[model samples]
Target: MKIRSPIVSVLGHVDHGKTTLLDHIRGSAVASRITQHIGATEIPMDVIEGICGDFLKKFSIRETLPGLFFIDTPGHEAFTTLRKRGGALADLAILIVDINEGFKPQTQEALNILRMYRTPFVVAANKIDRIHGWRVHEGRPFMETFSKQDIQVQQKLDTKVYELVGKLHEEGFESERFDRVTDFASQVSIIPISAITGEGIPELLTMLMGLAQQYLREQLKIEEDSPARGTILEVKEETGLGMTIDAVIYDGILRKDDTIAMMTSKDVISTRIRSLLKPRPLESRKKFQKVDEVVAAAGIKIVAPGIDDVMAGSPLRVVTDPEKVREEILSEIEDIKIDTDEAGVVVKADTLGSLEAVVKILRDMYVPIKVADIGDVSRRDVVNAGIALQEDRVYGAIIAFNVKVIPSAAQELKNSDIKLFQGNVIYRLMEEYEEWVRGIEEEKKKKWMEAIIKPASIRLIPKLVFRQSKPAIGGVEVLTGVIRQGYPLMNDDGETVGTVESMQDKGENLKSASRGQKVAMAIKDAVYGKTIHEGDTLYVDIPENHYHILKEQLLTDEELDLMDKIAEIKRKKNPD
Candidate 1:
């Protein structure tokens, strides 16, 4: 039987030892060169056997399957672009979580991505060496070492394990230690391991092998002669090779002279392969050997002319017919561009992978994107952000991930009010944008409250009735809160007397009066002696519905107290 390697992606939060774990598995420091902070690297299966063959034989498993191709993804954001047409490209995943720290934000984020793709995964409970008083037994499995620990240490470890178990339950998953899982399909298997000390790694490998042979055998079959289908991992300008692409050929075979089609921002690009290369076995991507052909489930670098238009994270296929492949690539590009909205903020990134990741997170946050594309933030992007201002002023902004702003656009942005949020970390950019949006909303609400007439309590000055009828004139002091022009006034019993026609402070017309301000005012309807008398106490006749609205807009203790007083006076009038 011809079997291809099962593609596996490793994802986790920062500092959860995702790379360290892969280093122990590969017995090399390849991850250091792949990603200084957050990047990805591939590991082939023959290496897996070389590392864990002895452990596999202990279970009487004689025939170990083909190699497992592992991809160590860069943090949670990059996982969004590690996908294919229908779902994620990887067949399986290993979700790493810190044993001592339990679940972090990116840990939960990885869980959500795995669930979104409907991919089956096992949890690697890493950093067990951080456990207090942990003892390492060379060449011993994790459980054996765990069994020999002191009872106190054992109890502490169990407490942390179950804490994660409870959290996973909250996320709608059932999980337990790998040895205790009764049903693989219903419960997730969590293998406790220390990547630094190399404990529990043998058991982790054995379980992965068992799962692949027993459950994933059917999905592993591949046709060696079929056309190649792959996702571009990166586009690079090699020192000697000119423009080249590092891609993962997931299906079929790719030959040295094969013509391939890839999607770009505007159209599908068909180009002939000038050269094909693969990394030397057990080596990092930096060192590659030229090859004539490569099979399915392999990582290969391609050098070709006209690849400058190619995009990272976009789909590519070996093309036998250029016309048919063009249409297919176009359709795939259309599918990827579905998340954009008609009017929203503009987004740019350095590559299609980062762009897709930014778009996915923005959509998850319910933020619309007017334009999303791969490249730097150009003057055109600034103009599109300005267009968003016509629909919503707050939405007029540009978000860039792992990209730079060109000099012309930077100068244009300096002259405009539209904001530019640029950062390498996806979640940090998201957080900053959300915080800015929240501030704009709060400011608008504050202005709206200030524009309205607020509730107030007032008292008629003693013997200060200047006019008796028609338009009663009086001098009164604002007792509690703001009293605005055209606001209806009422007596202590809540009977409408009249609206405050106007006010004057020291002979100057005032639009409103605040607490402790004595102002001369003319009432529109009240007759001094008949409807309202001297020394009469009154309140602003705010309706019950508007009263509650103002209460919600209250920002200070004084405003809240005045609202309570207004509510009490209105209740006394109807009492029903």
Candidate 2:
């Protein structure tokens, strides 16, 4: 019986040592290049030897595990969409979280995507060495490593581990400590390991192998006799070669001389492979050498002669029969649907990779995308999407990432019917999008609650004089609101004054102050000549409707009647 390798993706919060862990596992250091771009490392038996170095005795893939293909992705929030996309394409995932820091903002996002896809994954509690004086057992499962620790620290660490275990349980998962479970099965596991110390790695490799052999082998079967099939991860500009692409081949085989037509510039760029090789992430590394060929379940960098504008996320198929390959490529493009029922979201981000990630996330969320593009959103884009919606073909919304909507574009969107959502944080943007889709009533409540409050003003002069350096007394005319004790205050020209300190009526303390009822009281922070002045205005920190409410509540009938008579006499005298 033939066994296939599981295509696994590594994800977590940024700087949690994903690259370092992969490097320690693969032993060749090429996995560490993930900081440069999203990189793929094919860990076959030999590469494992290079990683294990002199400690090869601790782990052996040939006897214990099958081949593993690891795709190292960016752990930053900007790449969340990419992480989700990678998750959909993966057979399993390794979510690495730093042991000392626990879960982070982005870590939660990665977890959400995995759950959204219903994809299974294990948690690697990474950087165990950072927890001062910690020790781990070699070649044993996570459960055994804890048993080898010093009793005092072990007890303390167990509490932290159990806390994580409890959270996982609450999320509807049952995690285990390796050998405690009869089968690796379909369950998600959480293992604690230090990528720097090579602890827990041997057991992790063993678990992966056990899972694949016992459960996943039948699911990943592909025909070796057919032409190779794969997805392109990234497209780049090369000085000598012009354009290069990194791809993960999942089926059949790709040989050196075979000509493949890559989907580029929305057109096919058919070219011959000049060289093919997979990259290795090293602790200290510099260059890449050409290789003759790479097979199924391996990451290969392909150099094609004179090809430009190949689209990332496009699939690549080796052309065993040139005529058939042309037909297949054309048919695939024809069948490829640009889903607009949920008009695809237009995403703007800091870079190309981030844009891909954003698209992946929206797609994973099952939000139909009409168009996905990188760069700042434009007025033209808003108008186009609006037009598409009017024609009953798309939704008029733009989700921008790490890019500012130009003031002109924002104004046009406001006047037009297009919806624009901007976010500096990707997960928050996703959260808001989710909320918008699910909570329209909540949104309406928030909007109305904000509209009913207005600011008000009052004018005052010093009275009931008392002197620390000068008179502390003041007389205030309620220009608006029934000024009450403890009401927040603002001064002339609209700066906040201290809140109302106290109110006195008939030489006795009163609970509140009202308009047209002159009152006196000692004030807090009211200096003789500074902060408050003889003829300064005081305003209520509230909305316009409250001013009207205050007028009815504070001004007596006699006061309003006197004001009406004054206005009528003044008007009659001024009339010719």
Candidate 3:
């Protein structure tokens, strides 16, 4: 059996024309014509054919690449999870970056997702026609957009293009213009194309075809054994058919009567195919049905009798009999369960897709996720987790991706003992969490070795703020006893304050400030006037366990578990 056509996914920064390029390729505007303007396009095979043309015409001898499938996920924090799916399924990807604007935050996130999946992709430098002072007319060529064609102009454009190339190089990727490169055997390629003028697309299509035919075909070889299986790119509720799914078959054959087991919704939707429809004319709704067998490398919508539970991003399998596929289907459903030893942490992200990705990874790590959503971490999350943990020892924690924690929620977690973590970088958030866990473990080990010391305020020294350019400089007077260097400090209201950056006493360099003595200190990383105020009190700490106790005392109900666990083991070992 012939290997299935390679699946390709398009991903990039928003408004970079990813959908437009796909529409040009597919010959339809399913995503572009949508009213909402959100990323993610789910379409039928007929539309796919309409865009790519009939199989024979679309795949010319020179353009023998595998079939192309495009997925549109939201840019930036939203739909980040879709990128992972794209990376996993695609043999290769086209990273669409706006040529004039270069890489943005979403671009980095997409890049990270691709790297995480270890998927190889080419860069489509889009929007070349958007350059200032460039005259555009009907059917203008890409090269013609280069203004003046003079050495200076050409050199300037080269610099701009190479600027991005240089950044990519710094990130450990060696990329060059696609067509200029003689070989794709070793390096990554970047194709500069303008979707508006249809420039460089032909070459891109050619390169994609040539590359897939030459390199990927052997690697992604498919077999005709067993039942066919692949992923569902989209799912919708049609007016006639209750629930329908657009699936891309990877292996085996999905005949009209095959019963398929779909993962995700955990539904065993069994039925004979009601109808198999192919791509129609670009402007027509004419249904053609000779495309009875939806083989591997092809996309199709199955109008089965019962498919109410089908969902996008779900996996589907073609089966000979419904009875036989039950066990396998059940196993997949069981595998999707969120494992929780003490309930799961609440996971918040910008989209359902990202939430799913985080949940999957957490599940693999055996971490439980009690709740997940497509928004910021709010007070309700903390309060609900607190209530849920009434019976359990540990309260649920909250993890947010590229989202802000509302102040009300922050205060609630602070007062109630709920642990909250948020970060724009997914990897960084995980790293910090692991470090926190380690710190808790280490604190327990040191309990017996340390003593308790409660901090008390000494005095407040007020001084006028200085130049904002350098670190903050202020003068403080030690009115109580002796204030020593390297001692922790606090404000008048007992809030923990930053350390003394540096101290100089009365024009003399001194390591310590004594009672009745005034000293000048430099505060680091602070805007002198902003962080240090007139009424703030400074305090020093002796080696002790008071910090732990204070931390526990300040923790709200939700945080009891994490803080209590750390305290219990430490107190038992110390008993001081």
Candidate 4:
């Protein structure tokens, strides 16, 4: 069955940037060099059913759709303005939730409205950039970019998104990140996206189209010749034209001078479309050209009478037969149409759009937002952080993105009693936050590890012995781990033979020798020729607990392997 594509409206909190995503979605790299005048994007059917080639097989939607259409602006106010017969005007909607910020005030507000309207929606868990060590590849699929990130970054995304899953569960929606979802109907699909970078958008489209096509397949069908039905976006005056309506024709074909019916403050009014116009693509301003007629799923302007005062966002229809539709349209609008209706960190973006983007990603990293706003970092913002500081240190921080800090607030920040992250890149600010939080423990661990013995396996050089006795010194090659001054040396049998008193590399004083380094070391309590000599492999006497701590708190994969190898060498002495 051939049908019109579903109209997708993005609804979220105040700063959640509703349908701002559509502009970017249509911002194809193929057209990146050009100027975009319209604030909408059309994801063609081939791209939807094609890029989604295999993914769409999950459900069998035999309908052939034109494509997905997006409104210029989105949210409850816009959605409420689109009063149509039977229910909501938009067939599908996107509920944008910040990955890091979780559910905030307006997010809950959007949810309540969506629930009442029974509009099927998917959650966009936005802002994957905030994850530490995440390598950015703009406009790429979620898994493609997500898989290439560091292991720690991947783990961070898992926990951050899981937090959203928990919140969704609380809202009575069983949700999983996009790919993990098996039953599309039973489970809500949450897509981790970066609208700025265009990551995960493909997955968002695939799931949205799939769900809309599968669940609302029947409602999507329309008769091209029947009558044009649309929702009014704006009612305004035009030069030479008495009245005009800017609307999205969701279904059917509308021609010039066609009679249309729509609701007004008085009653349902019927009028003839004097002209039809289509907007031009220009960056400078709004411009349009005349059109004889238009098909469904398009943004167009209709010149008609008695519709100048028609409410914006309300439904409009073409009346092919005035006698029959007057009662039907009136009853339709009268009966069915009338009805209807994270505590982590504070973040500030120069604009609400940027703020939402940062908060969305912050939520993805499992960072909770105590409060986030736009404008200069005021003294009150610091006061809020002071409150979050007492509540939870981990959640107590301010991320100012492309925003300023007030003078007094800047002075107050000098105390270091709280954390304030300032940066333009959303990812960098959060990455700094992660490292800063971990740095405290890292500082302590690094110092303790330095003070304690380090693991090493060293072999005395063939003929590099500088002294045989009296604090015997010799050149040795470190085979595993690190050897430092004052570290005890043990023979292969695990008996303590000597202590490394000092180390020198190329006649320069050294505190430690790393693997693959040849250095001279002075030993105490042993004569090289008597107790140890050339060809003897010496191991650092690392205690069992010390080895455990080194493996857990310190060392990379390579260093850990070396430490384990040296530990095995020491364990050979007491195999029992």
> TM-scores for all candidates?
0.77, 0.61, 0.59, 0.54
lDDT of 3: 0.58
lDDT of 3 by residue, 1-576 (tens): 565456667777778888778766544344333111112233433333333323224334324333454555422324343322233656667888888888876676667666667666778888766655444432233344454355665565566678778878876777777646666755567766777666656555555554554456464566765577766655666565567666666677777766677654444565566665544523444443335566566567667666665555556777666676767665544443333335656777754455555666665557556776656778887776676455432334677877788888878888644667788766566666667657655675466323333332344455444433255567676655445554555443334456656778767887666556776766554444455576465555333455556554342342344234333433443543
lDDT of 1 at 67: 60
Model 1 lDDT-worst window of ten: 31-40
What ranges in model 2 sit over 4 Å off?
28-40, 44-66, 74-87, 136-145, 169-187, 237-241, 278-288, 320-371, 384-396, 402-411, 414-418, 424-427, 437-439, 442-576
Question: Could you give candidate 2's per-residue lDDT for residues 291-359 as a string of tens digits?
Answer: 666666667778887655765656688876777777776665433323244444555665444555566
TM-score of 1: 0.77
- What TM-score does candidate 4 reach? 0.54
Q: After superposition, how far is residue 140 of candidate 3 from its true place, in Å?
A: 9.0
Please estimate how well model 1 matches the true structure, expressed as its whole-model Cα lDDT: 0.77
Answer with 2 or 4, whichever has the higher lDDT.
4
**Per-residue lDDT of candidate 1, residues 18-97 (tens digit):** 88887776664343222111123444454555556476765332254456677766324476567675567788888889
Rank candidates, TM-score, best first. Answer: 1, 2, 3, 4
* Tens-digit lDDT track of model 4 for 80-114: 45445555667888998778778875676556546
Model 2 lDDT, full chain set: 0.61
Model 3 lowest lDDT segment of ten: 32-41
